Amino acid sequence: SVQPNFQQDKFLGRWFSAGLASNSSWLREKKAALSMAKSVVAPATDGGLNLTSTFLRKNQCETRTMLLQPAGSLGSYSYRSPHWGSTYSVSVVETDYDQYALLYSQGSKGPGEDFRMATLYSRTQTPRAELKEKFTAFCKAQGFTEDTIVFLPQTDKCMT
Ligand SMILES: CCCCCCCC/C=C/CCCCCCCC(=O)O
Ligand SMILES: CCCCCCCCCCCCCCCC(=O)O
Numbered sequence: 048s049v050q051p052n053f054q055q056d057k058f059l060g061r062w063f064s065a066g067l068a069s070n071s072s073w074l075r076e077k078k079a080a081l082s083m084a085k086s087v088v089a090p091a092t093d094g095g096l097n098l099t100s101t102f103l104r105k106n107q108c109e110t111r112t113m114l115l116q117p118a119g120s121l122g123s124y125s126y127r128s129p130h131w132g133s134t135y136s137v138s139v140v141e142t143d144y145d146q147y148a149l150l151y152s153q154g155s156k157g158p159g160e161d162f163r164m165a166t167l168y169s170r171t172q173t174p175r176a177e178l179k180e181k182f183t184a185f186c187k188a189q190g191f192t193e194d195t196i197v198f199l200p201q202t203d204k205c206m207t
């Protein structure tokens with residue numbers, strides 16, 4: 048479920064995408080060949096969030112923004128992907144705002160319906176070991192097997 052009493056304004060700002068788990072081998076593999084720089088969460092004009100990730104793909108920097116539209120309880124969003132012809136729920140299921148957040152995404156419509164992913168965001172680029180465990184704990188509870196849980200390579204290229 049969503050983080051109780053979720054406060055969007057405290058989730059804003061700079062995060063690092065430190066880990067992910069997913070039932071898509073392809074997505075995990077594609078992501079692990081990228082080197083992650085910052086993600087930034089900024090308010091969207093629709094009352095939701097823009098989630099922008101900066102990353103290195105074949106030694107070249109790229110940025111991608113996902114619009115997370117408000118969907119259910121505070122902390123629950125939906126992301127519509129024209130490229131995948133699918134929509135996906137995205138929820139901040141646990142966070143303490145000042146060190147970590149766990150996001151859980153599931154396909155809700157379209158061929159992406161079966162996709163599931165958990166992401167660990169950390170306010171620091173190397174998460175303390177406590178936070179890795181909070182992530183791997185959650186992934187296990189949600190039925191991700193140990194080889195689908197991966198920690199993502201990081202870089203300081205692509206920023207400033
Ligand atoms: C939460 C997973 C993303 C971790 C940040 C990595 C995103 C930056 C690069 C991703 C582009 C390549 C992956 C293609 C599908 C996107 C999946 C997604 O962004 O949720
Ligand atoms: C980067 C923020 C994470 C938020 C989650 C958004 C979901 C991403 C959409 C990409 C779809 C992945 C498709 C591979 C799954 C499959 O084909 O089975």
